[model samples]
Target chain A: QDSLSFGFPTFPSDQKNLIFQGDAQIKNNAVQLTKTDSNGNPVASTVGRILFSAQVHLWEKSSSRVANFQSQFSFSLKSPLSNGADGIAFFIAPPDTTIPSGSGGGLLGLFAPNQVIAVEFDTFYTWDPNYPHIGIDVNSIRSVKTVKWDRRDGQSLNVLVTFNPSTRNLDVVATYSDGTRYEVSYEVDVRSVLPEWVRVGFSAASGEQYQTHTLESWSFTSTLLY
Target chain B: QDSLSFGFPTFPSDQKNLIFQGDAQIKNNAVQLTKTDSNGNPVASTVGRILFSAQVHLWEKSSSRVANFQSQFSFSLKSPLSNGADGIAFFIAPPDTTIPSGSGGGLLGLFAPNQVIAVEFDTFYAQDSNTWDPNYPHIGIDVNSIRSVKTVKWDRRDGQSLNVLVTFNPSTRNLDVVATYSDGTRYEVSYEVDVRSVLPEWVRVGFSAASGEQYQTHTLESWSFTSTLLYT
Candidate 1:
């Protein structure tokens, strides 16, 4: 298990608003995030760190209604949940952007296929019946056609992602989360999804229907371990 | 300026149920079609054909769904209406299918985005507000990406649609229909749609929605045109 959790680590002051405050306090240590649905189904956890819970948060101030290159901002996780929850991107999409109502897990209306990047730490195969897997996603909200990631039950993952401004290409790779070890490299080309931009922010969705998730805690560290 | 019509040339004994009925009726020299909304809306026409007013009746017998097919079945027309309506296709889809409530002048959900392969008259540009192109939504074109059509006007032309990603590729291009004509070509009902199947019998087919020069009609067609827009 490789770890990228080294170095100075005080969360940015302005970044606090991005936190997805839950009904109860997320203790400083374990960082427990909890929320329930109208039916009392726990829409909890998803702390951005643990098991890649279904929830994802984006930089609050870095988002919008349309995808424009001018004001585009990027975000990544300090430590990917990597467990399974299938990570995704967010588009501050005006909260009221006319996307499909309700969520089916994964990244709810955040990114459009062939038009965005969704680095998933997936498992289970859901396409047939919401089965799952890991890979790259650039599908449309109206349809599902992601590129793909890890097979079933994979772990750690020192993943790095970069988006090139010149050719409009996105590059990605993954390693053991602990960093002490190295493994095979995985890659995908998001160039086909270029020319489009989404509101910069966090937006998450749950998938696999009727499952328990506890997103322990998470942080966004930049400049060093990207 | 161009006109065409279609129906049974003559009905035999028990075939009265198969005889074309409904608004296809004409009193004087002019034929009658139901109209309250204008006729140029995209939701109603596309490909250039207008939903010719007919007293269209869908039989509940064995023809419940479109008969499977290997080719597309359709009809046609000429000029101004053809110019404004684009072209049209017939349909035979699920019975419960219908136009959304209220006025949607421009886009006739006939060969609606996520549903059927109606007779697209194809005239204006089409697209749902959440998609790519915003202007190409017309009265005649059969489109897959509904998001491109914008919703600027909300009156009789109020556009509400389902966003989907598909291609209603036509397998064949020749079709026919029979009725009364204005140019001696015997123009009754002529159209082409996204209809192609292996089995197309006892199918539910009929005209859906109407654009009184305002909205598109036939989110359903009386023939198997409906199945072409939905299935594999």
Candidate 2:
């Protein structure tokens, strides 16, 4: 079909077709991407990820056709403390990518030196005037484009990310529980920054100030036009 | 196979196996069960529903067997006004059931006066002291009655997506429910009720929501159900 589609209405009891690293675990039918204490409080200085097991074909090198993909997911961030540190990201990284050591806080657990494209939902104000914002990152923690984010603690958020190969534009739309919506878009050439195949999933981290990151559901579809 | 299983991660563009009534529509890839103004504000005194097209076999009269079912769904309620009126429900109603007229406000659109079982996520307080409502935002289990048999306070009502898991065990005749919010807050409750005595052999399952004088928007993000027949 030259297309790929998958959805997780709710996470399964088993970890089939999924990979977890560090403190990530499936809890209450959702992916708990960060550590939590015995009392369900956020654990500090922790980083984790839950990734799709199979590599996604982002492009066909011979045909010079890149895949146009749309990914949507529902998540919530709960920070018990007054100030919530760090956040989470939906990332597409090298097939063999691994969690980098000492990658927490502003890094969002995706400080790899290799090719990676990330849409970061950052909570803490670090190096940026905006405390909460959505950023587009390419191969580095420094985002190429960023927009202020309107986020409330303990509120469930829904996000949709779409990548158009023809326009080389990566766009994101985030909606809050109160029906407030925000959008951010950036133009980047995938062929210049990533490989033909990539790993797609979520990454999150906690610093001195922490928050619990939970993924409720996710759906993804990609089409390659020949 | 004697079993039924289905899941909707996100509503499709076409309404194939689904039925929508009143103000219900598929918007932003989710089932929006209430009306909204052009400014995206909730409309008052509105009721709506999105149901599965096919009837589910809840029991077999010949074998005297009941079905054990588990249903899970993600939903959100957003109220722009100071006081949010009404809420939403997941209901198991008779196969030929239709929306009850004037069934807004606290009725939650499922005030059938017929055989109907519902799990209500209520946000408003109605009928003061006499009613069994725990007030505040709460989840309740109802059987042929708008007043829930069992109700628990739901503290996480910030218009965020919440997950609810409901399971009915034929052996124990127990209906167990667990709800979780983004902040790790959870509520669990269980009620013992015989389904075969209350509901018919076949039933239609879906969601219903309404808004009264005060307004709120109800949205169903995803849903999944699995049922297995059990023999005595």
Candidate 3:
């Protein structure tokens, strides 16, 4: 059995918009994830299960000169989860794509990088240091510490990003609980986003030990749908 | 100055619109005038007033059939003031449009039909005895009353159409209140609405008193204007 080089690919389109949309229960019963913090105070998402799964694929490949590897996905909590674990994370990396070790308090444990691009939905001081709210982070082999940015607490929050494989340009967006949404279109500048060599895929971890969580409702709804 | 008995004319392009878009606050700092009910509860607009005075000249002869008549002026309450005064009545009579003397509660003193063209905002019940809130209805010249209706308590609760009216239909059986602003908009509908009608050149928005030991007229606002509008 011989094999060739494997590159990052897009997710299946058929399964992209899998939200039981227009459903009564789904509308009234906002989808939310729940997780107990170290204190077991029943933080964010107390009424649902943390849905962590991605339609991703991977394979071994010879190092290529070009780095067009980037994953794309999006989701939101219909209603805030009781556990306060009402959050979601986006990531992509080596051996383990889901690198949120345990109680990824505040932000997903992936704040640091292990070759990861994470958009965290942190809402708890639970066990983390001085953290405000929902932030965006990029990781290289580990966490790209310098690329982390925190924002003021917004009731409901959302982030968006754009990545170019050929140019290594990465754009990011942050939407608040209100109706205002913001974007930080960043292009890896060839050296940062591409970094000579890297792979791409999507990973999300809404689970925590002390705290349990689930997605209120999620989907990668975008006008830039591929 | 001899008498002239002939016909008059109509002005079609004599209308103007002074709209207050979005959410307006009056008492609470919004466009809509709202306040806490006697029972202590938040409420939306009860009476909507656009106080801009305009000029108009209604001329006619034939002995002038109009005593306090004009064209058509209507006013709508953003939300119904269901409490103390659930309904507001419009009068085209004289400034002194008073109730019948020795006439008890039932109609709050708003009577003498031989004169006033009253547009009632009434939704209260006359007592069955005097038709007040039940009988002779000491309430006010409220709406939705076959015989007469009135409310014992002049205050408003979350549900009662008391001083606050959540719903109103001049011809409905009884007035009802079912609305809330607990949601983000904090906006809801009441039985009351905007009213437009013609009246005497100078009418001090008249009204009779409800059948409380002591009733209140609570001045909200009064604006008179003349302009054109979409016929539809």
Candidate 4:
């Protein structure tokens, strides 16, 4: 797994490759993507994200560029059982620290003008018309694929994604502590949507509902095709 | 993290450095020290333990030899809601694959009458009326004896995160140990004995755990060993 491989069963926040933006920071030993105001309420309409990247390119322009990768992280969304807001998503975008403008609520803080691919874990129901769900989005807020999310308050979630070059399919699986698991697939040519290289990270937003989404740990391993 | 360090938040059953003894085996990515026989019964009077060690001699012994080390591992003792049994431990012993005879239950499988320093986690109160678990679930430091030199009550609640850390300092010639639980709780114990005085200069450091008579599952979540020399 030479080209680029690392595991954060526990994050060493001291490392330089971890870049946090828009109210993100390391707290309680995990990456705290959202912060609470003095009154214990989540700051309104805030977007937070953290990017993990390297100087080396993850995707190269080649006829036989086989970039296969797998990444997983543990996260939780905690809020009042009755009232909650916003959601989180995993994305691969151009190498930069930019959060989409006027993007919050159901946008997952990922609806920018840039062309990118994102797998979102939505907590609110405004976009899906009702109920939390997962979706695969490409360069837009409308989802190409969607599945109902259990959205249990305070339940630890294990979210995993795997990409296969041969099939050109991205598979996502979200498992709850109660043994319930769901998977969604997206068919897209990553090399066409992304540049010769890309940066991978997580972005989250809070609407008026107010809740905190915390990423406890993350692990990524990939084979970079030259 | 200078000399040697490893952590096993997860362990593949296919890994090395883990040697299972008697009824020991790796299952579900965790080292299981005991299992029910084909007849669906506990292996009474039987001992099961796993030792984690490397081939290196650590550091050579010399006139100016000085070694300080730190090691830690996470584990769980789980069983039926109405039932439980036995215990587990961490030990620093000689470089050999030996499971001493008459070692099980409270013996902790570290009952080497020879040379060994073992830290035991005992869960059985089914023996020794006098010492009979006066503090049943407890942690103890034992040296050259089947009986513990000192023991502290061990929390028996299920799903409680259990971790132990052992640090040896050559300068102070003391061994400091601490135990932490998922809840904001802590246990501390210190012994004034340099490992060099008990074991050789370059020794094998690893974890050893066992179960007997009573029935319960023991799994090591992770462990790491590291050494640093004071002088060249």
Candidate 5:
């Protein structure tokens, strides 16, 4: 997708390919992915997941031409002070909204031979132990690379991810309100990864421990090659 | 006053004769009036009382000229958890950078018998009980005495930007001010205080704040002023 593009600098009532699944809602210039409902029930409490994706496809047959892409966004996550459950992830999954049957917490809801790329913000420590980190995954739920996240609640964050098909380089950078920046890069070939045209979105889940996850702002830009 | 004015949409270095006393510094996109310091230690606990004032005289002594003026600014005040003391104020005071010794908390630095007209954002209430009711957030118009001529219970929304506008008309001899909360709500109160009667011919226009044995943060985002001068 060379000239392929999408962005949500500030989300406004599902303007783009935003398909809200589970307990997600768009309000206050943000997308509330998951939190406790009116009856004080957590969305990811029992076998539940929330996924928000662009309803339409992001790229078509022109993968070789427009394979490079970049996405940037700002988010905040706050869970119960004690045991905050599960975690959240930014994923490029298949066109259909197939939420895994029972995936929660460390799984982040995308389960079973899921063919996609995901960048997970894992909060639950029992699984990876090195969690409270940012993990980059390809073609599976497990991450290929991970970096510990150093931040506190009430601090806003900005994340930027970019890809270049020519060099097969993928870059990710995260910044905090205190002016701290962390960056990581990887080499990946998109032509050999999976499908021709694909869908992109974000998914978040809450287990027994839950908190409010919010995407205050998001922006995506791609240079479509076709 | 038609063309004589000073404004800082974002306080930067060398913008104006901005006098900084106690603990006031320009950082980020706003002016941090209190909390933290050049050495980075809590200002309230040590020296206390923070004030920021524009060095230039806002208007000349030509009694007739520059009788009508309006100034507006945006600011935010936040505390460290449970307790927050003192507050902030916008005032036109004598040019000297006078900071009252040991003044913090509800005093707001300015003591009695001083020549000034101020609008205060009082967060804590007990100390200066005479000014307004205690244990509530309020906005007050102050002149010399700490007791306010008028006050309104503020719809306190911490960590949000709030705006205040003050306008004076020598013709009607009235001073009208309005405060806007974050959610587009507005509260306004007016008082008759003739500058010609109270203040000197030349005075400094600026802001001052204090924290008495408490840790709180105050930031000034932007400021602008417009006026018409009279030389009667």
Candidate 6:
């Protein structure tokens, strides 16, 4: 069984199984990906990541076969005002990937020196005309396909990303607490971007206008295709 | 050992050992003791409490022995406007005490049907000349009544974090409090109160908060408490 499945109804006190880098901390049983001052105000210009400690099998080198996987998580972003800067991403990167410098603002903490694939939930307007959007990225900050992200108030969002090996399409679906849903998809061959083994995790960053990004729950599974 | 100590660096996911009533919730690793709407705005005319599940051994009945306790906690209050209504309190009340009706404004949610002792951080003034509230923000000690026996002016700014230390010594029956803001401003007050006169052997200890027409968010960041029984 080349599959992995795990869920955090609430994060445990011990974090030996997870790797946290930069400003990330397990707060309120949720993964807080940005720093906050003593007064609970969001800290600006910070980047953070939380990854699975073990390496994941992304593709088979001998068979040239890829894996069918699904990743689901719930998160929330809050700022003093309605406008929040930067955003968060779910990315698959090389096993040795580390947070890149100068990735704190519009980069969304997914900018790496090497090859990577990411699905981003962006809140700020950067190069794109959309203010809040969901985008699919292939080794670049510029998204291949983007969709408007309509969120109301400071509520948690449920996101599901599925990769189909047969169609070679990576799809994203984001649902708000008020039953609003938005989606975007992109076609990409993992063999071209990722290696036989890779690391999967979540990354986030904040700019001058900062916001608190929290990962409330997450579960992921991938089945190797024979 | 006739002693107990506990600390909440952050509240646990499982709250089996704690009790929360009304609008109180565990948010961002802190205890939020008032209601906030979907927009994250504080809701007015609400009261809430978060308490330890077990009754604390405050005093011994057979020997009439009282316990000396010290509590330290960090907290922050935020409001859109600088003026926030009501305030918060740390209290020791009868084991069966419940939140009182009509206790939302200026009462600090410490009003109960039974005897209660509280150290209040008051931000709003209720009555003109009838109530003991001063014009400015203050900290006070109250025993079984809303009118405080002792009060000292406290300088607090909106959305600023504060650290507070409260200690009770049975030898002198003196309750002392020291509060410091994030900017290093400090306030201190002390009062004499014998626990045996107002409370029983066992009691419920926790925090309570409320808001009136004006509102603000009240959060308890971290807390640590310890008590030692004193036998005379």
Using all chains and alpha carbons, the TM-scores for the candidates as numbered come to: 0.27, 0.51, 0.28, 0.48, 0.46, 0.50
lDDT of 1 by residue, A56-88 (tens): 112112222111121111222222233334343
lDDT of 3 by residue, A1-226 (tens): 0110111112121121122211011121333234334443344312222221211212113323333333233343322343333245554343223334343343344443234455455434411445424444555422222232343322344444555545555556665566565544443433333222222322222333223322333333111111
The residue-by-residue lDDT of candidate 1 on B171-232, one tens digit each, is: 33322333222233222222344333321222233443334343332221112111121122
Tens-place lDDT per residue, model 2, B107-148, is 888884269888988888664734354456778888876457
Highest lDDT: which candidate?
2
> Is candidate 1 or 4 superior in TM-score?
4
| Model 6 chain B: ten consecutive residues of lowest lDDT | B9-18
List the candidate 2 regions with Cα displacement exceeding 4 Å.
A1-226, B127-135
On the 0 to 100 scale, the lDDT of residue A151 in model 4 is: 81
Off by over 4 Å in 1: A1-15, A19-100, A106-117, A126-132, A139-157, A178-198, A201-203, A207-226, B1-232
Docking class of 3: incorrect
lDDT, candidates in the order shown: 0.29, 0.80, 0.31, 0.68, 0.64, 0.78
lDDT for B111 in candidate 5 is 59
lDDT of 4 by residue, A1-226 (tens): 1134445555434434467788777766677677777654566677889886342244555335657888788898888656577888888888764877877776777775356888888877623556888888776545788888778777889989988877889999989878899889988788777775567889898878778888887876566443
Tens digit of per-residue lDDT, candidate 6, span B22-119? 78987766788998878667888888888865456677666566889998888888888778878989988887777787777777777732488888
Clash totals, every prediction: 157, 0, 119, 3, 32, 0
Q: Output the lDDT of residue A202, model 3.
A: 26
Of 2 and 5, the candidate ranking higher by TM-score: 2
Candidate 4, residues B1-232, lDDT tens digits: the string is 1133334455655444456677777676666666755543345555676665332233345436466777777888776533466777787776674778867666667774366777777677744534436545777776654456666666676645588888878778777889998775887777777555566544565556666556666667777665655643
Assess candidate 6 and give its TM-score to the true structure.
0.50
Model 1 compared with the native: what TM-score?
Answer: 0.27
Worst 10 contiguous positions by lDDT, candidate 4 chain B: B53-62
lDDT tens readout by residue for model 5, B11-96: 54432235667677676756777766555333465222323332222344533544577878888877654566567788877666
